[PDB]
Design a protein around this ligand. Sequence first.
Ligand SMILES: [Ca+2]
Ligand SMILES: [Mn+2]
Ligand SMILES: [Mn+2]
Length: 430
Amino acid sequence: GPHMATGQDRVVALVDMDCFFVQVEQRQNPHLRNKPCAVVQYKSWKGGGIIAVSYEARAFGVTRSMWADDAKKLCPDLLLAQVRESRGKANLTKYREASVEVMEIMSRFAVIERASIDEAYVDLTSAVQERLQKLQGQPISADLLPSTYIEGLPQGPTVQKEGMRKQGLFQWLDSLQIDNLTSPDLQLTVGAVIVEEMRAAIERETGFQCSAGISHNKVLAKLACGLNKPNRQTLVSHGSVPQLFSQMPIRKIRSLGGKLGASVIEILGIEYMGELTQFTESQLQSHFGEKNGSWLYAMCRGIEHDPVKPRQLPKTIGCSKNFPGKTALATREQVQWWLLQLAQELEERLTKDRNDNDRVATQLVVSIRVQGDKRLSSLRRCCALTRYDAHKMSHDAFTVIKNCNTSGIQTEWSPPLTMLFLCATKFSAS
DNA sequence: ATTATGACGCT
DNA sequence: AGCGTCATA
Ligand SMILES: [Ca+2]
Ligand SMILES: [Mn+2]
Ligand SMILES: [Mn+2]
């Protein structure tokens, strides 16, 4: 009862850009705006691989991982933008730089955790406390929440989407106890006000639209964000969790989309997150381990303590290329030439990183895949990274992998290489 | 023949 | 350390 922790201590948001690489290309090229369009890498093989899709194109059934030739079968008027190619490979610099634009704006409001190229978590607990003091017990107007959905509302005793949104928001605001500076629901609401401001700032200063989730932890914030996309934000309260989770497939929760999630389903014979509540903590720990079990026991009740880490910059800088089917590398000079290409992009990114962010990478990680291996990586070896020089890094990379060549002939490489990967790690301040 | 990443857990 | 899992454009 009174000692039951409810995991309502924090206000956490997740902000995720809408169709991000597509918006970067649509900003650049006005002809692509408000059209079915997608972003593709490479072109020779089946028109290239789709990696981002506008909402207009999704309506035709176009998805990520689809070959553009196949996407065109669903959407004959689909417009395409190509990922840049440099040194023989896809180069994602434009999208990394656009990401920095957004992350720098978000950082003005609070400490952020960069979680991908297009999303960051925000711990708004302190910002909310500050804003609550400014508000002075004054009610929150619906006008301050013009793109916010309250999950689970409206309920109880109009037919268009925006109408429904306002109905739910009204019920929510009508219920709010604004006299209590410590009410979690009030704190979430003020959190949502700030995120409206954050999202307006991102759109004003970059042109990019985004969605967001506001809740008491990262998992719920992420889940909330996806509930009303694009260009909207969703508040998931603690109270909304039982109904929300009662029909929520387990795989939809972050970290449960893979083998662990499948094992939760199979071992326990359940389908929905809410069904987890009927197991003891020890029962869950017995099946899924101490850490996972405790996490599941709290998470199915809407509770999670994973902090928003203060980290705005990626921890590693990597360059990778696949060589599928017949393009697999079978000669030493092939292997060496491509290691050099990767190393040259890596040097360029590392040198920029050092100037921008006052740090230096100290370890070089080299990974390859061999033809036949089911695994994405076959072998991973590290060596020292002492100088930002591509010729040295590629020579060093070759040295640490050259023993994988089973071929009796030095000139030939066997089995052929279907992937190369260079990653700079272990940064130190500089 | 999705590809190019990037964080974190296990032993 | 090297490998595996899970994640996003
Ligand atoms: Ca996104
Ligand atoms: Mn994302
Ligand atoms: Mn996505």
